[PDB]
Design a binder for this molecule. Structure first.
Ligand SMILES: *[C@@H]1O[C@H](CO)[C@@H](O[C@@H]2O[C@H](CO)[C@@H](O[C@@H]3O[C@H](CO[C@H]4O[C@H](CO)[C@@H](O)[C@H](O)[C@@H]4O)[C@@H](O)[C@H](O)[C@@H]3O)[C@H](O)[C@H]2NC(C)=O)[C@H](O)[C@H]1NC(C)=O
Ligand SMILES: *[C@@H]1O[C@H](CO)[C@@H](O[C@@H]2O[C@H](CO)[C@@H](O[C@@H]3O[C@H](CO[C@H]4O[C@H](CO)[C@@H](O)[C@H](O)[C@@H]4O)[C@@H](O)[C@H](O)[C@@H]3O)[C@H](O)[C@H]2NC(C)=O)[C@H](O)[C@H]1NC(C)=O
Ligand SMILES: *[C@@H]1O[C@H](CO)[C@@H](O[C@@H]2O[C@H](CO)[C@@H](O[C@@H]3O[C@H](CO[C@H]4O[C@H](CO)[C@@H](O)[C@H](O)[C@@H]4O)[C@@H](O)[C@H](O)[C@@H]3O)[C@H](O)[C@H]2NC(C)=O)[C@H](O)[C@H]1NC(C)=O
Ligand SMILES: *[C@@H]1O[C@H](CO)[C@@H](O)[C@H](O)[C@H]1NC(C)=O
Ligand SMILES: *[C@@H]1O[C@H](CO)[C@@H](O)[C@H](O)[C@H]1NC(C)=O
Ligand SMILES: *[C@@H]1O[C@H](CO)[C@@H](O)[C@H](O)[C@H]1NC(C)=O
Ligand SMILES: OC[C@H]1O[C@H](O)[C@@H](O)[C@@H](O)[C@@H]1O
Ligand SMILES: OC[C@H]1O[C@H](O)[C@@H](O)[C@@H](O)[C@@H]1O
Ligand SMILES: OC[C@H]1O[C@H](O)[C@@H](O)[C@@H](O)[C@@H]1O
Lengths: 130, 108, 120, 130, 130, 120, 108, 120, 108
């Protein structure tokens, strides 16, 4: 679906923070004893509203909330870290968890270049068949 | 972008005949596809949404079917007032796109 | 319910012009509103959509940086402020109402159209 | 293997409870503040002994117990939530974790309809080869 | 890369311990109440320095440390049990998470025996084509 | 050890009949017990199996709702109570002992057979 | 259901020669396959279980092999008393099914 | 910087011999050191590599159990102690310096070679 | 082992010409591949490492390219001093292996 932001306002700029998974490379800063404290592991940046992507994302977060809350109702886990990993697993089971039927809408295998290789090799023996 | 191609370009049919119009997408739009009628110099009018749902006030001869990359609009029995251009439109992704229209002529 | 468009006519290339579209018979704040244009002898091309807030605008690539869509719900009016106009922009411009605010289509009500002609 | 229930008795009916992962759709009931308490998230139903499936399942649970207990002995995790996910991962590694040898008993790829497509396209150029 | 142990010394023998995931098969020893205590679930063995594999492994552990520590910096999980499972998932997404382009360096599908089957079946109708 | 079957003979369609199979020389409670039938000129068809409890019965689709298998371990006897009999049910009926209770086969001991003929 | 097909249907051979019988399944039954002998008007007798294991009291000339969807029973040197019908039987799934039997004739 | 090899000459099959390779102009302890041999009319074959400790030795399969490589960093010398020599071992033996300690190659400095001939 | 095959075996070229030498591996060695020059009776000399990096003191006419299973050493303009044998060498796995060498002859 396309996202049409239907909120009263939209802040069009996203001043963000995230973590640096490899925050140091040289020296002893990778050693926990010497490295930064909890407050200093973050990097920052600024994104603008090209293609209205910020305004779309805010609405998306809004619409995700209901389904997310219902998911949390059904689990007995105290802290859930596995939603994206389970999505990845479901992706894999969707494509390759069963038999892949070629030309079907759910099998993503292309033999078209493999078609140009076997349709060019039709002529590898049929033209020189003396 | 998702390109929408309508076929055929022209239709000449007698009143009472069934008309079948087709809209094809370059990749799947699932069921996010609507059809509009635009008769000469009047405002366009919504006929069908979500590939198969008939809009309020539209005669029962109009129906829609299809999914994925293939959709059809059927008019079960033509009357003179259906001369118009018909457009499909997808809402799965930005930019919103329209087909090129089908102009239906009534062969009286 | 009706959509009445206005502001069309002749304008020189490089100029600015504001179009308006007035809603009647329904509360404007409940629906997304769009602009669609029809060049002579051609089909329909979507131009812009505005959602619930003035910053919730989406545009066709060929009008980005040149056209701005906006709304004034208190006066029940939609606007299109155009700049840097070219010969390719002469067209009949339609306003279009969505069935809801949070999705851009189906278009269940259309205005009659206002013609904007950019020509020397 | 087939399951032959070898227990002294079998209760042939299974009056069950489980959870509703999406227990509400309309209104504000999805909001935790307004929704049901812990005791009210369950749905119920009744299954009868068609094909002796209830009697088989009870025996199966019995036979699972030993292997399950030994698995729990070897882990250091306090609460194990990952047995079914690990089974899914092992399924995927069993089929596609290595090279798939076609016609082998462990590769599940069928090119039979792909065979009817290439055996019909033998005649696409060989009969019209003027 | 090959591993060249660059440590001051190398103990060439590895006297190891690990767990027995199925430490009993017969009798009641699988039942937790009757089975061994925490201290008795381990098996042991002795590996020698064939191919210098012990000396290589020690150096490998050394080189892993930096990257591992940086990974632990970025997570909010208190105990991480999922590194090998995430590696398995990434393996699967690397090969089959997208379209497999045949003859490419990242698609591991061999149709060579499938080539000998279709190149022998060229002659199944072309020689008997009376 | 022996399995001695009884109860066969002529019966009209629609009637009921109970067959028995008596074990000798081994404790019946330790093994699953089955019924297998042989129609004239045909092969062997499995009919039913009973496990350790009276509710642990499995049936061929074509006898479900019509045949009930049961056991009385204290009298070392197995029973087959048939109802709604048809012409297709005339056959030599064998009893069969499993090597164990928790799996249905191999059949390591077979009775001699009792013939039940459903015919007018 | 899993259909079991035995082949060949008839065998006429002299005493002392080797006889090879085959049982094929429509899908894998791994090694859950047994063989029974049934001689005319006597009770059937278990010969082989788990595809390859010889039952107690059965002569050494009887052996079984195979796995998956293909199984074989071999009689290494025929004697006159082996005249009978031989059946395979699978236990991987309910319903239990039997093959159609092989009738062995002694060619004296 | 230089690598000077020594110890070559004629030796009978079955005998033992120790080769040495002396480094000059750089600290030996910072680099992995290797042995590579060249049989007459043939190419280069890697024989052995030694890392930072005497137990960190890797060998070609055809010399395992027969050749031992070692180092004495305090005397800046590398050694190859050979046993159970055969006709296939006559060759020009090169010493080779790695660019680092923890990886076996590139070889950025090579000695001139010492010839060991195993022949009767 | 990972077998390294160098081609061609001989090259006879005049001064000023471009020389292209090739090394192929039986399985991927990514970029773990070096080239060495060995001129008659002198110690070998490192020319190229990590498939493309020129060693210190080596003239600018030497360059390396490639990845995976295919690598090339180029000498853009020959001078008489390049008569030598050239070897590739992989370090992805034990045992370390060398190619068979290329002998370049200068056709004066
Ligand atoms: C996702 O976005 C939604 C908007 O697109 C958010 O919707 C809000 O949902 C809450 C539900 O609790 C509403 O709160 C109630 O609203 C009613 C009606 O609002 C009227 O209230 C004032 C004062 O009386 C009145 O002057 C106006 O006419 C309002 O229309 C109130 O009676 C309640 O007191 C309560 O405020 C929000 O009103 C609603 N927003 C809008 C703009 O309608 C939704 O919260 C977002 N999701 C998340 C997770 O934040
Ligand atoms: C899975 O199903 C199994 C049955 O199919 C369950 O088996 C039970 O296993 C326990 C093991 O602790 C047995 O308990 C012991 O049994 C012996 C022998 O039983 C005899 O006891 C009475 C009284 O003396 C006697 O009159 C009978 O002859 C019994 O045969 C006793 O000496 C011990 O005191 C203790 O009770 C059960 O007997 C056994 N069940 C049966 C029916 O044999 C197994 O528990 C199931 N798994 C789980 C996890 O529940
Ligand atoms: C992985 O293996 C590495 C070796 O291959 C280990 O390297 C060690 O890293 C630590 C970093 O904290 C070094 O510790 C410091 O070293 C400096 C320099 O060492 C000199 O110190 C003595 C005494 O002054 C001197 O006599 C020598 O010249 C030493 O060279 C000291 O100034 C500091 O006090 C501190 O000791 C180790 O020296 C270094 N090892 C070596 C052999 O250089 C690394 O630890 C391994 N990784 C893990 C996780 O254990
Ligand atoms: C596909 O194409 C290439 C073209 O270089 C050809 O060499 C190869 O043999 C083909 N592969 C198969 C499996 O036919
Ligand atoms: C397989 O069959 C279809 C039949 O519609 C054919 O059009 C298609 O080209 C075939 N695919 C390949 C890869 O040959
Ligand atoms: C591949 O080879 C086998 C050879 O036994 C042949 O029977 C089979 O039909 C072939 N499969 C396809 C898909 O052509
Ligand atoms: O590695 C840090 C190192 O720095 C130096 C000395 O202060 C050592 O005591 C210390 O261990
Ligand atoms: O959304 C629930 C809403 O209901 C109404 C009022 O009681 C608000 O105060 C309250 O927040
Ligand atoms: O299963 C163990 C079993 O052994 C015997 C008796 O001591 C029982 O009370 C006990 O339960």
């Amino acid at each position: 679906e396309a996202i049409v932001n239907a909120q009263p306002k939209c802040n069009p700029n996203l001043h963000y923070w995230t973590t640096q998974d490899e925050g140091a490379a040289i020296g002893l800063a990778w050693i926990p004893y010497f490295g930064p404290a909890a407050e200093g592991i973050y990097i920052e940046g600024l994104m603008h509203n090209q293609d209205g992507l910020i305004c779309g994302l805010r609405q998306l977060a809004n619409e995700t909330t209901q389904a997310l809350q219902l998911f949390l109702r059904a689990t007995t886990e105290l802290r859930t870290f596995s939603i994206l990993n389970r999505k990845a697993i479901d992706f894999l089971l969707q494509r390759w968890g069963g038999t892949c039927h070629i030309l079907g809408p759910d099998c993503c295998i292309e033999p078209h270049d493999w078609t140009k290789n076997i349709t060019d090799k039709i002529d590898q023996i049929i033209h020189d068949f003396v | 972008e998702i390109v929408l191609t309508q076929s055929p370009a022209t239709l000449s049919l007698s009143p009472g005949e069934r008309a079948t119009l087709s809209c094809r997408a370059s990749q799947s739009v699932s069921t996010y596809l609507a059809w509009y009628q635009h008769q000469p110099g009047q405002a366009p009018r919504l006929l069908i949404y979500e590939a198969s749902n008939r809009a309020t006030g539209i005669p029962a001869r109009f129906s829609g079917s299809g999914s994925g990359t293939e959709f059809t609009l059927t008019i079960s029995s033509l009357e003179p007032e259906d001369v118009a251009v018909y457009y499909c439109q997808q809402r799965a992704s930005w930019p919103l796109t329209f087909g090129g229209g089908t102009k239906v002529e009534i062969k009286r | 319910v009706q959509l009445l468009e206005s502001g069309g006519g002749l304008v020189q290339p490089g100029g600015s012009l504001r179009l308006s579209c007035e809603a009647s018979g329904f509360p404007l704040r409940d629906y997304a509103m769009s602009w669609v244009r029809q060049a002579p002898g051609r089909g329909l091309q979507w131009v812009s959509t505005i959602g619930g807030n003035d910053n919730a605008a989406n545009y066709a690539d060929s009008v980005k940086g040149r056209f701005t869509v906006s709304r004034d719900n208190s006066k029940s009016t939609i606007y299109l402020q155009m700049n840097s106009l070219r010969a390719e922009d002469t067209a009949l411009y339609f306003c279009a109402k969505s069935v809801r605010l949070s999705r851009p289509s189906p278009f269940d009500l259309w205005g009659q159209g206002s013609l904007v002609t950019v020509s020397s």
